[PDB]
Each structure stands twice: as structure tokens, then as C-alpha cells.
């Protein structure tokens, strides 16, 4: 299939150009809302954990596929292992508001605490890259006596204006791994 390659219109070619037939596709694993709706762990601080999604590592699945977008919308789901009582404050709250139990405070029950947090930012969408370290937009903050594990989960995820993904660069021709297989 010849075309004007500089016009940047999307041009796809099929196998039917040389006598094949294009088959059916199931793309339910590469859609945005499905693939981002899973927990990813971040390294927590000792007490105060500002909840923004740039604490996710960039080499993880949710981190890299999150940083694929320029803009995003999500509600948040957090699962915290903590000592004492976990306290959440929304976006724009002072840090002394983290010392009050009238703010949403989940008392300790073993082994962890799983709670749903809404979108509390004053912006219509958030950003992965801000021209202007982006602006102080986040999902509030939590604190306990100590926080040992902190998980995020993006739900109702929407993404806008895609940005590059980079795979690992091999030293030889192919990047080889040890794919799991039985010994015998």
C-alpha cells in the first residue's frame, strides 16, 4: 500500500493485500479502565502520606500506563496497613487537619484497611506533565501512627493526550528473560 507518508494520516495495511484475510480481535485487556483498575504499591512515608499518583514507580504497570497520558481522571481506592487510626483529609486541607478524628478516620482492624476516596481536586482533570514537578494537585492525605504498606487503585479511569512508553533497551539483539516453565 503506497501513500503520502508525510501527510500523517493513519494508514493501515492488511494481509488481504497479498491474499490473506483479517481475523477477529478481542481487545478487552488494552482498554484504559480495565488495565488501570488494579492495586499498585508505593513506598509510604512514616506518618504523613500525601496521596498523589506520581508516587507510583515509573517501571510498574499502573505507573507507566498512567504516565502514558497527559491528562487523567480517576476516583481512588486505597488499601493501607497501619498502626493506630488512619485519617484522611481532602484536597486543600491543612496538615493540622490530619490530627482530628472528625475527618474520615478508619479505626484499626486487622490486617488492613480498604477504603474508597472520591475525586476532590479543583481541576477538571489532573496532569502527568505540567510545564509551569507539577502543581499541588492530589487526592488528599492520610496519616497514622506508622504506615507500613500503601496501595493505590484507579477506578473510572479516563486518559487524554497520549505520551511515549519506553521498553527496556537490550544489549544484544533481543531482550531475553527467564519465562516461567517446568524443569521437566
Amino acid at each position: 500500500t503506497t501513500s503520502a507518508g508525510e501527510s500523517a494520516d493513519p494508514v493501515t495495511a492488511t494481509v488481504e493485500n497479498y491474499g490473506g484475510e483479517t481475523q477477529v480481535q478481542r481487545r478487552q485487556h488494552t482498554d484504559v479502565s480495565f488495565i488501570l483498575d488494579r492495586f499498585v504499591k508505593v513506598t509510604p512515608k512514616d506518618q504523613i502520606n500525601v496521596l498523589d499518583l506520581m508516587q507510583t514507580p515509573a517501571h510498574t504497570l499502573v505507573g507507566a500506563l498512567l504516565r502514558t497520558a497527559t491528562y487523567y481522571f480517576a476516583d481512588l481506592e486505597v488499601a493501607v496497613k497501619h498502626e493506630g487510626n488512619l485519617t484522611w483529609v481532602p484536597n486543600g486541607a491543612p496538615e493540622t487537619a490530619l490530627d482530628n478524628t472528625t475527618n474520615p478516620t478508619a479505626y484499626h482492624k486487622a490486617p488492613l484497611t480498604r477504603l474508597a476516596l472520591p475525586y476532590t481536586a479543583p481541576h477538571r482533570v489532573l496532569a502527568t506533565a505540567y510545564n509551569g514537578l507539577p502543581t499541588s494537585f492530589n487526592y488528599g492525605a492520610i496519616k497514622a501512627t506508622r504506615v507500613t504498606e500503601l496501595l493505590y487503585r484507579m477506578k473510572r479511569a479516563e486518559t487524554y493526550c497520549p505520551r511515549p512508553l519506553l521498553a527496556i533497551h537490550p544489549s544484544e539483539a533481543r531482550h531475553k528473560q527467564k519465562i516461567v516453565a517446568p524443569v521437566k
Partner: protein
């Protein structure tokens, strides 16, 4: 193709399926699934590398240990050129119409 208007060329893209070693000559690759084109007013040529496999799904990597070169080879050959000495042929890659990608996993390297 990003050469000048007085630079002509003729290229050949071929698909070597796995099972024997891939060809080194376009006359040897003429017995594959191939497509040949030349430069002109339309500069971009799109070729659709097909899914030929025994299984209907193929792995996206090897762990580390050993596969030889499974799922075959993509072979870019040039046939002729006229005053195309040192010009560039740039190449993009994208998913096909029936391309699908399943079983999510997290390994490393964001």
C-alpha cells in the same frame, strides 16, 4: 522514502517463517511471502506482516534461557537504486487491524 527527486530505489520486504535459517539474497527470499515496491510520487508503503503460527497466541518475550528465533524473521532487501547513494529510508511500526494483546503482567522497567 526521504531521498531527493533524482534518487530512485526499489525495495523488497519478506517474511521468513520459523523452521529454517532466513535468506541472505532477494532471489532466495522471492519464495517467501514478500512485497516489492519502488519510489515515486507516493513516498510511503505499508506492508502487513501476518500472524502465522501453530498456536493462535504468541508470547511477547523469552525469559532468558533459550529459543532460537521463534515467530520467524522480517527481511528488508533493496533491489535496485539509481543515484540513491546515502539517502534515508525511514520506517515506522504500528498495530494491524486484527492485532490483539492479552494477559496483563508486570515484570519491571516502566
Amino acid at each position: 522514502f526521504t531521498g531527493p527527486t533524482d534518487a530512485k530505489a526499489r525495495y523488497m520486504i519478506a517474511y521468513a517463517p520459523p523452521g529454517m535459517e532466513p535468506p541472505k539474497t532477494p532471489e532466495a527470499a522471492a519464495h517467501c511471502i514478500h512485497a516489492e515496491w519502488d519510489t515515486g510520487l507516493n513516498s510511503k508503503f505499508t506492508f502487513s506482516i501476518p500472524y502465522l503460527s501453530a498456536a493462535d497466541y504468541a508470547y511477547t518475550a523469552s525469559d532468558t534461557a533459550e529459543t532460537t528465533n521463534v515467530q520467524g524473521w522480517v527481511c528488508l532487501f533493496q533491489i535496485t537504486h539509481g543515484k540513491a547513494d546515502g539517502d534515508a529510508l525511514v520506517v515506522l511500526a504500528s498495530a494491524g487491524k486484527d492485532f490483539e494483546l492479552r494477559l496483563p503482567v508486570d515484570a519491571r522497567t516502566q
